[PDB]
């Protein structure tokens, strides 16, 4: 006779969690264990619209991408202020926000 072993394959996951999170919540950071970096500010100004055009998101995701690059993570949006009229700035959507870090571990 001759015996059957066995042995159970693992396979690695493959994980691709998002850094840096809109959170136009105060009470969330309040309750929540979090690092306070500074806040950031992502603006789009157009001064003409030759230019890519200065949506919320936009200047949102400039703010996100500001706020990662300053090793946040979350970024309480205080004010998506979009202001006109401005000479040499046609348009600017400035979009403000603290840049935070969550310390959850």
Known sequence: ???QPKAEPAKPKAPRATPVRIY??????????????????????????????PSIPTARKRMQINASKMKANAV???SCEVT??????????VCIGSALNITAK
């Open 1 to 3: 006779m001759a015996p």
């Open 24 to 53: 136009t919540n105060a009470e969330e950071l309040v309750g929540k264990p979090f690092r306070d970096l500074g806040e950031v500010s992502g603006d789009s100004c157009q001064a003409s619209n030759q230019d890519s055009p």
């Open 76 to 78: 309480l949006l205080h």
């Open 84 to 93: 006109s009229g401005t000479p040499g700035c046609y348009r600017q959507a």
